[PDB]
Amino acid sequence: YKETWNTGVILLLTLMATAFVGYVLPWGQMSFWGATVITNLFSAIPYIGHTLVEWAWGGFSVDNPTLTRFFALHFLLPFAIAGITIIHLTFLHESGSNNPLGISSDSDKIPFHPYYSFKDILGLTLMLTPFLTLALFSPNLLGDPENFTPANPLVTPPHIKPEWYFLFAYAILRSIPNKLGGVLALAASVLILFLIPFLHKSKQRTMTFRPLSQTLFWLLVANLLILTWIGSQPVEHPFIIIGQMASLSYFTILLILFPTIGTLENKMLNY
Amino acid sequence: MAPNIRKSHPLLKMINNSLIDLPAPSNISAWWNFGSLLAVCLMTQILTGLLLAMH
Amino acid sequence: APNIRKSHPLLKMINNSLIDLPAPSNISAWWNFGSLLAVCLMTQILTGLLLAMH
Amino acid sequence: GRLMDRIRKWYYNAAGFNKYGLMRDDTLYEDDDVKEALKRLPKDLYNERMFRIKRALDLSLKHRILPKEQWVKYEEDKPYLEPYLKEVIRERLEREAWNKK
Amino acid sequence: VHNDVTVPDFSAYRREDVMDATTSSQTSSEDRKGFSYLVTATACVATAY
Amino acid sequence: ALLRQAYSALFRRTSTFALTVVLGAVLFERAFDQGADAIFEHLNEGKLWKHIKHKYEAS
Amino acid sequence: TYAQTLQNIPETNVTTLDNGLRVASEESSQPTCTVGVWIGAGSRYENEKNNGAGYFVEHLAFKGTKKRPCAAFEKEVESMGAHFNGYTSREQTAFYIKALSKDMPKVVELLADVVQNCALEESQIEKERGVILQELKEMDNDMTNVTFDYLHATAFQGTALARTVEGTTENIKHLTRADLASYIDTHFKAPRMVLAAAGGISHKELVDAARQHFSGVSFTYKEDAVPILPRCRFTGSEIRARDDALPVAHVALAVEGPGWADPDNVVLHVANAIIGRYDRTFGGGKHLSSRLAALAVEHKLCHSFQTFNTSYSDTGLFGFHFVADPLSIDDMMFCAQGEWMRLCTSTTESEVKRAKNHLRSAMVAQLDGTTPVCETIGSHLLNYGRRISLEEWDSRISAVDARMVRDVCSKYIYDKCPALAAVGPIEQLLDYNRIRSGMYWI
Amino acid sequence: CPGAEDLEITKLPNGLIIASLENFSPASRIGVFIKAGSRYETTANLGTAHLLRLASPLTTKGASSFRITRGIEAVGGSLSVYSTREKMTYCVECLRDHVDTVMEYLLNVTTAPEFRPWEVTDLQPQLKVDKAVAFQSPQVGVLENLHAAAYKTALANPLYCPDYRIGKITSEQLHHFVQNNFTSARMALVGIGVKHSDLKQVAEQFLNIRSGAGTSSAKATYWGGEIREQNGHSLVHAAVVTEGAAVGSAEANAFSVLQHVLGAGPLIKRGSSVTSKLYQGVAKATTQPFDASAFNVNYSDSGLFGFYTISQAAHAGEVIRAAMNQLKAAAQGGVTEEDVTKAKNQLKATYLMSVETAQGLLNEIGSEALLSGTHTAPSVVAQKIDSVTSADVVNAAKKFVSGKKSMAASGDLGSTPFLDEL
Ligand code: HEM
Ligand code: HEM
Ligand code: HEM
Ligand code: HEM
Ligand SMILES: CC(/C=C/[C@@]1(C)[C@H](C)CCC(=O)[C@@H]1C)=C\Cc1c(O)c(Cl)c(C)c(C=O)c1O
Numbered sequence A: 001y002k003e004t005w006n007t008g009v010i011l012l013l014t015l016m017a018t019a020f021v022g023y024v025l026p027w028g029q030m031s032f033w034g035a036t037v038i039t040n041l042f043s044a045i046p047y048i049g050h051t052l053v054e055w056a057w058g059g060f061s062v063d064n065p066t067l068t069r070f071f072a073l074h075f076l077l078p079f080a081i082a083g084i085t086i087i088h089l090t091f092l093h094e095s096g097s098n099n100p101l102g103i104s105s106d107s108d109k110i111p112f113h114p115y116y117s118f119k120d121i122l123g124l125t126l127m128l129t130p131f132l133t134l135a136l137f138s139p140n141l142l143g144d145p146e147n148f149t150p151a152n153p154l155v156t157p158p159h160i161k162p163e164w165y166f167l168f169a170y171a172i173l174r175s176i177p178n179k180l181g182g183v184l185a186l187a188a189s190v191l192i193l194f195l196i197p198f199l200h201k202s203k204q205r206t207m208t209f210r211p212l213s214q215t216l217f218w219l220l221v222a223n224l225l226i227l228t229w230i231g232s233q234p235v236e237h238p239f240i241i242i243g244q245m246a247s248l249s250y251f252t253i254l255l256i257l258f259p260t261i262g263t264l265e266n267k268m269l270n271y
Numbered sequence B: 001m002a003p004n005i006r007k008s009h010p011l012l013k014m015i016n017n018s019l020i021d022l023p024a025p026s027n028i029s030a031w032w033n034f035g036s037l038l039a040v041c042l043m044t045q046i047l048t049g050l051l052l053a054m055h
Numbered sequence C: 001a002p003n004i005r006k007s008h009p010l011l012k013m014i015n016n017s018l019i020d021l022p023a024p025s026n027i028s029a030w031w032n033f034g035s036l037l038a039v040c041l042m043t044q045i046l047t048g049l050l051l052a053m054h
Numbered sequence D: 001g002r003l004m005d006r007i008r009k010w011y012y013n014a015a016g017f018n019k020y021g022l023m024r025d026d027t028l029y030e031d032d033d034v035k036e037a038l039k040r041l042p043k044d045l046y047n048e049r050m051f052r053i054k055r056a057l058d059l060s061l062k063h064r065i066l067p068k069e070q071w072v073k074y075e076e077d078k079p080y081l082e083p084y085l086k087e088v089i090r091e092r093l094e095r096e097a098w099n100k101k
Numbered sequence E: 001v002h003n004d005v006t007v008p009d010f011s012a013y014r015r016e017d018v019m020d021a022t023t024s025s026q027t028s029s030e031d032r033k034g035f036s037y038l039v040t041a042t043a044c045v046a047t048a049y
Numbered sequence F: 001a002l003l004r005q006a007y008s009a010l011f012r013r014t015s016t017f018a019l020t021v022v023l024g025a026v027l028f029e030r031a032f033d034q035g036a037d038a039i040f041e042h043l044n045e046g047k048l049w050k051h052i053k054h055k056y057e058a059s
Numbered sequence G: 001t002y003a004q005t006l007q008n009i010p011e012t013n014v015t016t017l018d019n020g021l022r023v024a025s026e027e028s029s030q031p032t033c034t035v036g037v038w039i040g041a042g043s044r045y046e047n048e049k050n051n052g053a054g055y056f057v058e059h060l061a062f063k064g065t066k067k068r069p070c071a072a073f074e075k076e077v078e079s080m081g082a083h084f085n086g087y088t089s090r091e092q093t094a095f096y097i098k099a100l101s102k103d104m105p106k107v108v109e110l111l112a113d114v115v116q117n118c119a120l121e122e123s124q125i126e127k128e129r130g131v132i133l134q135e136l137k138e139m140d141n142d143m144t145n146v147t148f149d150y151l152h153a154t155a156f157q158g159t160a161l162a163r164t165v166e167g168t169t170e171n172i173k174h175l176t177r178a179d180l181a182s183y184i185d186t187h188f189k190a191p192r193m194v195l196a197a198a199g200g201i202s203h204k205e206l207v208d209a210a211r212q213h214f215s216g217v218s219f220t221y222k223e224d225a226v227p228i229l230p231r232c233r234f235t236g237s238e239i240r241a242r243d244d245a246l247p248v249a250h251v252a253l254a255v256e257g258p259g260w261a262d263p264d265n266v267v268l269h270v271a272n273a274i275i276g277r278y279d280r281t282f283g284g285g286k287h288l289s290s291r292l293a294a295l296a297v298e299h300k301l302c303h304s305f306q307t308f309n310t311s312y313s314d315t316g317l318f319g320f321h322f323v324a325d326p327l328s329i330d331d332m333m334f335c336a337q338g339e340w341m342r343l344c345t346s347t348t349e350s351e352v353k354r355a356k357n358h359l360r361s362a363m364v365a366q367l368d369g370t371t372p373v374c375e376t377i378g379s380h381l382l383n384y385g386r387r388i389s390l391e392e393w394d395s396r397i398s399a400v401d402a403r404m405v406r407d408v409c410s411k412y413i414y415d416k417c418p419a420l421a422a423v424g425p426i427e428q429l430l431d432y433n434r435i436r437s438g439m440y441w442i
Numbered sequence H: 001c002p003g004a005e006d007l008e009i010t011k012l013p014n015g016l017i018i019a020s021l022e023n024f025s026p027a028s029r030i031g032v033f034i035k036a037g038s039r040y041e042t043t044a045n046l047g048t049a050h051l052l053r054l055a056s057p058l059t060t061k062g063a064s065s066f067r068i069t070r071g072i073e074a075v076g077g078s079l080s081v082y083s084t085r086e087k088m089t090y091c092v093e094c095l096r097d098h099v100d101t102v103m104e105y106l107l108n109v110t111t112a113p114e115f116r117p118w119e120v121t122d123l124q125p126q127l128k129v130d131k132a133v134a135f136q137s138p139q140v141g142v143l144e145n146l147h148a149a150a151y152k153t154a155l156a157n158p159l160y161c162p163d164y165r166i167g168k169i170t171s172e173q174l175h176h177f178v179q180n181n182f183t184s185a186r187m188a189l190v191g192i193g194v195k196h197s198d199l200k201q202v203a204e205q206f207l208n209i210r211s212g213a214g215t216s217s218a219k220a221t222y223w224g225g226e227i228r229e230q231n232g233h234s235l236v237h238a239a240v241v242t243e244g245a246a247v248g249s250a251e252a253n254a255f256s257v258l259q260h261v262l263g264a265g266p267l268i269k270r271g272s273s274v275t276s277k278l279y280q281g282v283a284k285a286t287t288q289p290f291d292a293s294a295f296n297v298n299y300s301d302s303g304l305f306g307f308y309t310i311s312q313a314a315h316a317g318e319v320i321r322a323a324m325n326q327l328k329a330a331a332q333g334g335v336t337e338e339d340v341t342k343a344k345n346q347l348k349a350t351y352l353m354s355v356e357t358a359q360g361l362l363n364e365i366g367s368e369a370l371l372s373g374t375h376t377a378p379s380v381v382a383q384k385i386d387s388v389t390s391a392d393v394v395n396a397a398k399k400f401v402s403g404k405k406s407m408a409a410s411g412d413l414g415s416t417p418f419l420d421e422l
């Protein structure tokens, strides 16, 4: 569902940018060093690079202007999210939802309400339970503590990690031991989502009836699950090696394997 | 004309035409519940967000 | 199909609400405030952000 | 050497679309050619393919499958669409090539 | 009938160069357009600035 | 005839029309700028620091 | 083989009688044949007060002469199995007869007796008055026509070409014996006529019969002078005749054409072949080579459409006409202009190759009978000056290619202000400004 | 360089006729004439002939729906199918250098059709259209009903598929109609602008399908009916006829001459047609506009003959009756030895001219080369024309006034007469 999908990817990137700048507002140690590293990423872009950083900061080193234009930015984006979400859902509606077996469900549709409205109310009370169990009983479980220490422009904490949801990328960035390569790998680590629709070779839509793709699919999940662990560990052996691996692994399972096993599977069905 | 005021009204025809009379496959699994949860989060984030922005 | 101005879920909107829109041939200048009002909004919003950043 | 056979038959039971009573062809994702092919299906073959599918969806909503007995068998799977589809794709390649000339 | 129908006189509005019913309006076209398109080209340059 | 020479070479082709607007906006700017600044500075002789300037400079 | 069969066709012989009349023919072993006199005089030649004379005349040229009244004329023709019929356009009238190759000479005399001694009995004139006034009530319900007239009517507005061939209602209601007379006198003159014939006839024996009955004399230089007409001005405009009570809508769009003389007319016709024409009963359907016909089929854009390259002495009309339902006029018009722009910008060699072969065949079907071959000869001398052979036409048609088509269509179509004529429930089609903008950027 | 050839005409062992004729025109026109048609239809497969006519552009065993159109279009060629209640004529027409190209499709269309269920059923809605455009001419509305009243079978079958049968025709009915009618013994592969050695080599080396009569048409019984169609339309069209003569029969020429004697459509634009008995006769009876003519149809095992009148709704009575007396008066010696000499020329003329157009010519060679595998010279046909005596004419005129009559009429018939009043 290409457009529904592409707007999705756009959503993801936007949510990421948002959550990032939010995390900078309390102006703690991560807040600062995060702000420093991420805006510094443009520095990898030749020429217009070192300048692009100047705006970003509003000065010649992170400071107050950065913090106010970040609060502005944070305040704004969520709405742009809500906006695009509307489009996401609109493109969707042209086609309709997909379903597990991946075969037309025109022979059997049902009114969203009360079937899925009730099902979603329930799905809500379920996510809500651990979300609240977490937020109420163990508040800081999921969050880095460096942000309890007011930013220090002179000291970068030794155990500087990003919020859990960015680790996997942080992991890849720390793989490529070259400024631009790491940056490109990082960009691609998310932007690669735009290519998925084009790397589809199976003659069937889902993996429900594709046991090989399934294994590959779950092998990929465990693959990310690892990068996250790696992202939470220091840049020392055996980690460094395990790291480069999982990354190399990530990009291969997506650009080479999947589309390959896919073709293979087609032949095994005699197509 | 339109009998019910659910299918004619320029607005309710929308709440109704995109979440109430919407055609949904009868077999979507729990993996399809994330759409709404994502949606709900957005509203919850935005709300709690403003409350904070006010301090 | 045929034109990508009337089918596209988006352009069908830019086109269906400001380009193929049926307008009375005799509206006077007192009808130009709708757009000016609109334009303000975008101008206000833009200059506003710029300021919120300081 | 019945290897390819041995494998295919394996993959066939591996997929498991037969547990729902679907023929290998009921699972094809409906792109442009497949859609055309289906319009060329004889009334009855189309109405049967429909039930098979409407039945598999109902199974899926219920989270069940057919009792082992009713499962399609690797050798009894009728490739009811395969030949239509191949013609659709052959008629298409002709056009495509003829417009470049 | 459609035979009794004719196109009124637009002399009150015609451009000087296509006022004469016996001269190829085609010669003065290149200009009539070049001028109107020059006004636009300028508006674009003025706004571009 | 410029109007015809222009139309035929510049305004006809919607691609060359653009090149004209750009190429033109460039020239128009550089000139409209000097002119206006020239008009303004003239209208305020000896009041601008550009004028006073030499009194505390170097030579 | 094609190439040769083209050069074998017997050349057309031409010889002029010292009174200006021109005689010409193509001899075949055909036992039957056709002969007629093609007069270069129509409605463009009429003024505002005599609009519809060339037509009021075409009606009486068969109701008898001075030498032989009605029944004697008709009877003398019918009884020998000949076919007398003709027509009259904006700038070219003609009267021709189809008969056995034996009556070749007896025919010539008949033709000459109509163009010179038309009776014009005033008993007949108050009858053909009610008859024409009737034919206008019929012709008026012919959309295709009501439309092309309105097209000229505004395309050449303010000039001579902007007039219908049938003329006004007031003219037909008041035209006098005098005017018809004076019209024949001023226009039906030797230097402006052409006796053409083809079939199994002796060019010689034809020219003789001519010298004998086609005998008018010329003293001054005036009589041997062929007037030059005051040029017609093309106006980019539109005329919208609306009636939402008509079943379908008719639309015609055109730009000014070059005129018979210009060689480009060849290219323009090749161009028109690429777009071609279509209509509800074409078996080809969705597979037709004409991109527009396809779309037409695919989306149900129309009931029919056709390109056209109408030429005149000094001017012309190059465009297209389609018929459609009220609710699809827009898309059709859209796709249509679209295909024109493709012409000016991205025509391929494949499209032209076919375009050429399609023209070549239409060019031969032009000469499928003695009447058609005679019509070609009649209108070739009268318009192109001499006779243009198929072998020649074909050489010109082969010379054309992509680059040529693009350069020429760009010449007469790109960024031009067209003339529009819409008739019927045309609400969906709209604004000249828009249609105008459809004239550039493919 | 090129001159004069000979109209050759072979006939292979299977009964397939091959009639060529090199006339060196820059264009050729090949055509397959067949003895098929709406008369071999039954109440069971009605309209299957009509649809077969539109199904000409459908995929065949050798060429595709797409490639047949694009293939013919590529060489400025053309395909067309004309048919009568008993004769189908598939034929192409291209420039000399492309005869081979346009042939393949002509061969593929007539001999190897597939009539694929889908193509076929996507095409059946066209019968709805094709029949609506044609039926715009009331002229074709009264002819349908005529043949219906004039017969009980075969020729009584409509030329355009009746409505109730639109969308109920099958690929089988198409196939079975082609297998049992397009048999080499009923087929003739004519051609113009072509050398016989080629047109022949193709017909043989390429053509096939079954041979031998196959199914045969059930001889047309005569009925003598009366179908009136009240429909408002201000102009009342009418046609009163009686069994005429068959094709090739002797008594034909006589009617053909009794045709031109009563008047067969004007020869002078906006004319008055004096040489037309019937016309003049009607004029001397009615005051307002009209037209009336000599109707003559020649079919294999039968024929039709009589007149046709177009008149205002009110003057329909006087016009039709006056049209009769004028036919009786000609049955009772009212024919000059001269009217017969003039009618003899008009007939030699009409024939001689109709063969100038490539279409009309190929259709002359064909028709004959299919109904006898021969070819009369335009010199022999000339004799048969004038070998008609002033008697034969007066006889045909009688055979009309005496035989049983059929009639068709459509319009505001309120003033039109019933057959049992003439
Ligand atoms: C603001 C973020 C997002 C929100 C709130 C959102 C919301 C929705 C909703 C409500 C649905 C419908 C219900 C469902 O099927 O889940 C949906 C469907 C979908 N979304 Fe999103 N979405 C988001 C992000 C994304 C992302 C990141 C992607 C792409 C990587 C994506 C891909 C899709 C697709 C493909 C569908 C169709 C699902 C199907 O096949 O049934 N969405 N989304
Ligand atoms: C896209 C939805 C949103 C996301 C993903 C989001 C995320 C975040 C994050 C990750 C933080 C840092 C939290 C922490 O660890 O302290 C944060 C803080 C904050 N956000 Fe948001 N936010 C969202 C919407 C909003 C909006 C729209 C507002 C207000 C209208 C808002 C205002 C703030 C403020 C004031 C803070 C800083 C103080 C604090 O951390 O409590 N947020 N946000
Ligand atoms: C954010 C404020 C507003 C904006 C940007 C806005 C914009 C527009 C626009 C663009 C139009 C169409 C063009 C026109 O007719 O002017 C319109 C029409 C209209 N607006 Fe507003 N509007 C605003 C406020 C209002 C207010 C305060 C009223 C009522 C007290 C109003 C009453 C109307 C009405 C009645 C129409 C129809 C105009 C007609 O009859 O043609 N608008 N508006
Ligand atoms: C509805 C459109 C808007 C209106 C009517 C508007 C109006 C105003 C007014 C009256 C003031 C006081 C101006 C003064 O100094 O006299 C102001 C100031 C300001 N507005 Fe807005 N505003 C609009 C949109 C925005 C938005 C959306 C932002 C930023 C995203 C913004 C940011 C500010 C800020 C930071 C100031 C205070 C500092 C200053 O006065 O320069 N405004 N606005
Ligand atoms: C995960 C990531 C960047 C993610 C972005 C930049 C995407 C590549 C594009 C869209 C976004 O806006 C994200 C914030 C960078 C790695 C990364 C971090 O996130 C953070 Cl918080 C820190 C403190 C460091 C320190 O070294 C880091 O290397």
Ligand SMILES: CC(/C=C/[C@@]1(C)[C@H](C)CCC(=O)[C@@H]1C)=C\Cc1c(O)c(Cl)c(C)c(C=O)c1O
Binding pocket: A089, A092, A093, A097, A116, A117, A120, A121, A124, B019, B022, B024, B032, B033, B035, B036, B039, B040
């Ligand atoms: C955002 C949402 C539902 C939201 C609430 C807010 C309802 C409007 C009322 C009751 C609730 O609380 C739901 C969570 C549904 C999103 C949503 C969709 O847009 C679409 Cl097209 C589909 C096919 C589904 C299928 O499950 C879906 O969940």
Ligand SMILES: CC(/C=C/[C@@]1(C)[C@H](C)CCC(=O)[C@@H]1C)=C\Cc1c(O)c(Cl)c(C)c(C=O)c1O
Binding pocket: C018, C021, C022, C023, C027, C031, C032, C034, C035, C036, C038, C039
């Ligand atoms: C806001 C706007 C137009 C805005 C711009 C921004 C265009 C999108 C492109 C070019 C411009 O610069 C316009 C000012 C038009 C508002 C607007 C409307 O919404 C509607 Cl329903 C109507 C009937 C009119 C009639 O005049 C109108 O002006």
